Amino acid sequence: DPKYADLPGIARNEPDVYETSDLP
């Protein structure tokens, strides 16, 4: 978001959610 982007401690180029595979 461009609003929070001004802050120094922002995560960039990272996935939002880590999840397991649905298929066994």
CA–CA distance, 3 with 1 (Å, rounded to integer): 5
Buried b (16+ CB within 10 A) or exposed e, 1-24: eeeeeeeeeeeeeeeeeeeeeeee
- Does position 2 bind other proteins by CB under 8 A? no
CB of 5 to other proteins, least distance (A): 10
Q: Looking only at residues 5 through 24 of this chain, which bind other proteins when binding is defined by CB under 8 A? A: 6-7, 9-12, 14-20, 22, 24
Binding residues vs other proteins (CB under 8 A) = 1, 3-4, 6-7, 9-12, 14-20, 22, 24
